[PDB]
């Protein structure tokens, strides 16, 4: 649908849409930019991720409200029907993001920073699918999230310092996966603690600005550890 707009114009409009808090538009501009077929820069990857995180974040919040109402009513068909409508929409957005990653962002990503970023996204969007999945479907979706996060972790531990913000955010989100999806709270706690401690020990190497970036995410790891222990 964005095929007639220049790549650079899509990127410019995605930044405008962010400023206007128009995240559906932002995501559509960044989908158009990905579909131009060129690799994404660091800033462009962040625009893609921010756009879809906001879109799916609103869907997830609405799905949770509706799921809670539906569960209370099971203690007419309308609540279930509407929860199903929101759920299908959410699944469609996750499938769209996964399809961009598969066609062809991941396979073209050779540098560790890009490949880890995209594999973390792949884990995240399978995790959002897992949040709404029920049954054996849930098993295979969970394993797809796990496999994406694990490949990202393996690359990040070989190629990035322990304070790298992508490496830290990946570990944070994989720990949430373990706690909330995989029923592995001890694995979640161990990953968050090890990640925090290894980052702490590397802070001495950082500039003031990098220190701020890394310590921000470390505080999120600590916040989860405080909630989980």
């Amino acid at each position: 649908a964005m095929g007639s707009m220049e790549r650079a114009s899509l990127i410019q409009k995605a930044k405008l849409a962010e400023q206007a808090e128009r995240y559906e538009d932002m995501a559509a501009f960044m989908k158009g930019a990905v579909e131009k077929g060129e690799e994404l820069s660091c800033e462009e990857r962040n625009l893609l991720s921010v756009a879809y995180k906001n879109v799916v974040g609103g869907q997830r919040a609405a799905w949770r409200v509706l799921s809670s109402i539906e569960q209370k009513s099971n203690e007419g068909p309308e609540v279930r029907e509407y929860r199903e409508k929101v759920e299908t929409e959410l699944q469609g957005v996750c499938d769209t993001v996964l399809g961009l990653l598969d066609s062809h962002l991941i396979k073209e990503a050779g540098d560790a920073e890009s490949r880890v970023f995209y594999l973390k996204m792949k884990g995240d969007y399978y995790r959002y699918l897992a949040e709404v999945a029920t049954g054996d479907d849930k098993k295979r979706i969970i394993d797809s999230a796990r496999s994406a996060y694990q490949e990202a972790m393996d690359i990040s531990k070989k190629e990035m310092p322990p304070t790298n913000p992508i490496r830290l955010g990946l570990a944070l989100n994989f720990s949430v996966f373990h706690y909330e999806i995989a029923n592995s709270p001890e694995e979640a706690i161990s990953l968050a603690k090890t990640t925090f401690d290894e980052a702490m020990a590397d802070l001495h190497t950082l500039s003031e600005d990098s220190y701020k970036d890394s310590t921000l995410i470390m505080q999120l790891l600590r916040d989860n550890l405080t909630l989980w222990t």
């Binding site: 962010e18 800033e43 962040n46 921010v50 906001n54 974040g57 944070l172 989860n224 909630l227």
Partner: peptide, 9 residues
């Protein structure tokens, strides 16, 4: 449990 907020560029 909080994941990366990730909502602001």
């Amino acid at each position: 449990a909080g994941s990366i907020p990730g909502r602001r560029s």
